[PDB]
Design a protein around this ligand. Structure first.
Ligand SMILES: *[C@@H]1O[C@H](CO)[C@@H](O[C@@H]2O[C@H](CO)[C@@H](O)[C@H](O)[C@H]2NC(C)=O)[C@H](O)[C@H]1NC(C)=O
Ligand code: NAG
Lengths: 49, 50
């Protein structure tokens, strides 16, 4: 015989912060011998990027 | 495609600070030295050698 009007919240995630990483900087950074050594691993850094 | 970073040039930190803690001049500048049969044995540690 009657009715009521109610408002309910519904939170849904959409995205997060976009993240980018440099492999040679994160692993060792400013080391030349490390830089020459990492190129023998193939396209791991390219795949991650 | 790549990353941007500049390279360092020189490697200097603060200054030297040794000051030869141990007096090597005491054992090296002496008016009397030991003999071959009885040689004075000196142990030097916790200092800096220059
Ligand atoms: C249906 O419900 C509403 C609220 O739940 C009723 O409205 C109330 O009515 C009384 C007297 O009739 C007032 O004193 C209140 O202030 C009203 N509430 C509001 C929020 O305005 C309504 O009367 C009900 N209808 C029936 C047919 O029962
Ligand atoms: C210490 O050495 C210097 C240079 O070798 C010398 O002139 C001086 O006489 C020495 N000191 C003593 C007490 O002999």
């Amino acid at each position: 015989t009657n009715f009521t009007i109610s408002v309910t919240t519904e939170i849904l995630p959409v995205s997060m912060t976009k993240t980018s990483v440099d492999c040679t900087m994160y692993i060792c950074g400013d080391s030349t011998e490390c830089s020459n050594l990492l190129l023998q691993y193939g396209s791991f850094c390219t795949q991650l990027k | 495609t790549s990353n941007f970073r500049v390279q360092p040039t020189e490697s200097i930190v603060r200054f030297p600070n040794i000051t030869n803690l141990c007096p090597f001049d005491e054992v090296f500048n002496a008016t009397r030295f030991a003999s071959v049969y009885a040689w004075n044995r000196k142990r030097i540690s916790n200092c800096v050698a220059d």
